[PDB]
């Protein structure tokens, strides 16, 4: 889960859109490519439930996942 983001409706102030991952360090690019040929084989439930991006873990209780038990 990259330190940056992985790879009217305008009411006010939603979560972060994204963050750079391509122009980032060439070492970061190499590691990202290896872990992405892994990702197509293993993208994990840790990201399937919600992909960890620094953009999307800011505003609201989306992590808190507002819900109660089933009847």
């Amino acid at each position: 889960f990259l330190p940056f983001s992985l790879g009217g409706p305008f009411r006010l102030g939603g979560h972060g859109p994204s963050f750079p991952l391509k122009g980032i360090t060439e070492q970061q690019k190499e590691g990202l490519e290896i872990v992405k040929m892994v990702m197509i084989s293993l993208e994990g439930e840790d990201g399937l439930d919600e992909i960890y991006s620094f953009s999307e873990s800011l505003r609201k209780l989306c992590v808190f996942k507002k819900i109660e038990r089933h009847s």
Partner: protein, 489 residues
């Protein structure tokens, strides 16, 4: 509008309660007594803000504070209550009729103008906000204008005064029901329902005065005065007033915070709210709690416009409330909303807001269903022009289901069961639901207010049957249920 609906019960004493008078029943005394008793019970269960008094036009020996001749004053204007029920039970049935014979008797001489005099006195007696004043009267004597013409003229004059005063009078069929034959000439001053009056439908409480009015602060610039109201109510348990089981004396249950240790009366000040979570008791305070609930001022801040097409059954919450346009400090509210309703064919895109109920409490997103001026041809404003407050849920308002997605069956099942359900079409009736616990409770209250032998258990329309639909439709539903081992295990 608050107001006490004063109702007077004029019942004869000479023969109109005792002569068949073009009928064959017993003395109308008993039927009239049971009718008025029923309506008293209906008020007790349904309306205790309406004053009642019973008068006997015709009186051999006067029972009257007015002391006027031919006046029998039994109950003064007052809200319905058990003393009056006992009072009438004295004169209920043929036993009550022979009582009436005992203390004053029937065949009683009448004084019509004096009756109007004394009932006017009774009306003058009230000292409270009055909503309505009606004279309720039954008489076999539909047209006793055979009296002296002076009495008839004076009575008509008094009628003109009282209806001019606003006093209302009702005479209803007792001799020649229907065909306008009843009141052969006492139709002059008066211009059926026995079944309803005996039926005494009750337990109906409804709004009397305005309440909960706000403004449509749609933007930071515009507000629009409005009012929030309810017509769907959750029936309550009547208040358990703790009475001394011996002496019927109320209870001063002195409940307070305190200390289990040092025997001192604590206060909200020297105490603090707290939240035992994880490794930290998260402390709070009463005003801290209010602030945590204190978000914004009450009113309607417009958050958008959504079509009346996204709204679905799963898009539902607590029963919706209503908004009527109001003009107390916002001119044009009614005018602009009239524009909205005329262009409501295009305004299926209804208003969106996060409604703030009051101060110190948070707003909540509640949609607004545009209520038109749906005035019926009989001039009933069903759904008065306004907005129904269907409440927008949150992710809070969810309790998830599993996902065992089920697939449709063969269309012959759908067709045969469509034929079933439309053949078994239950007659639509919105005013058809009465709760058996509620009804039986009313019956226990009224019955165990007198020495009634038993409170009837009201068989309600809400009760399903076994054969009424099995004769309107039949077992062809089960025969159509052709699958092996039907759910009739």
């Amino acid at each position: 509008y608050s107001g006490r609906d004063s109702l007077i019960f004029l019942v004869d004493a000479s023969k109109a309660m005792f002569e068949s008078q073009s009928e064959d029943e017993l003395t109308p005394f008993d039927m009239s007594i049971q009718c008025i008793q029923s309506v008293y019970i209906s008020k007790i269960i349904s309306s205790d803000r309406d004053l009642l008094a019973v008068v006997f036009y015709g009186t051999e020996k006067d029972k009257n504070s007015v002391n006027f001749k031919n006046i029998y004053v039994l109950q003064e204007l007052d809200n319905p209550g058990a003393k009056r029920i006992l009072e009438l039970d004295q004169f209920k049935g043929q036993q009550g009729q022979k009582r009436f014979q005992d203390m004053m008797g029937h065949g009683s001489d009448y004084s019509l103008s004096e009756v109007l005099w004394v009932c006017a006195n009774l009306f003058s007696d009230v000292q409270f906000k009055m909503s309505h004043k009606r004279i309720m009267l039954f008489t076999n004597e539909d047209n006793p204008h055979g009296n002296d013409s002076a009495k008839a003229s004076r009575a008509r004059t008094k009628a003109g005064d009282l209806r001019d005063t606003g006093i209302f009078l009702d005479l209803m069929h007792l001799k020649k029901p229907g065909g306008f034959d009843i009141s052969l000439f006492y139709r002059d001053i008066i211009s059926s329902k026995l079944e309803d009056l005996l039926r005494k439908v009750r337990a109906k409480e409804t709004r009397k005065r305005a309440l909960s009015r706000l403004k449509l602060k749609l933007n930071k610039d515009i507000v629009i005065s409005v009012g929030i109201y309810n017509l769907v109510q959750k029936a309550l348990k009547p208040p358990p007033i703790k009475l001394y089981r011996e002496t019927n004396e109320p209870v001063k249950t002195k409940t307070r915070t305190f200390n289990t240790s040092t025997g001192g009366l604590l206060l909200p000040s020297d105490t603090k709210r707290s939240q035992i979570y994880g490794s930290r008791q998260i402390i709070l305070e009463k005003e801290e709690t209010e602030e945590l609930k204190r978000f914004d001022d009450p009113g309607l801040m417009l958050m958008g416009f959504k079509p009346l097409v996204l709204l679905k059954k799963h898009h539902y919450l607590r029963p919706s409330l209503f908004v009527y346009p109001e003009e107390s400090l916002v001119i044009g509210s009614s005018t602009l909303f009239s524009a909205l309703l005329i262009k409501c064919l295009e305004k299926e895109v209804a208003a969106l807001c996060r409604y703030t109920p009051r101060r110190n409490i948070p707003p909540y997103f509640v949609a607004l269903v545009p209520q038109e001026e749906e005035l019926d041809d009989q001039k009933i404003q069903v759904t008065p022009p306004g907005f129904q407050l269907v409440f927008l849920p949150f992710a809070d308002d969810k309790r998830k289901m599993p996902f065992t997605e089920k697939i449709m069956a063969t269309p012959e099942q759908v067709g045969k069961m469509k034929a079933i359900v439309e053949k078994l079409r239950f007659t639509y009736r919105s005013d058809s639901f009465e709760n058996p616990v509620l009804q039986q409770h009313f019956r226990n209250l009224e019955a165990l207010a007198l020495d009634l032998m038993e409170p009837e258990q009201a068989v309600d329309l809400t009760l399903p049957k076994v054969e009424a639909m099995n004769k309107r439709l039949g077992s062809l539903v089960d025969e159509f249920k052709e699958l092996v081992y039907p759910p009739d295990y």
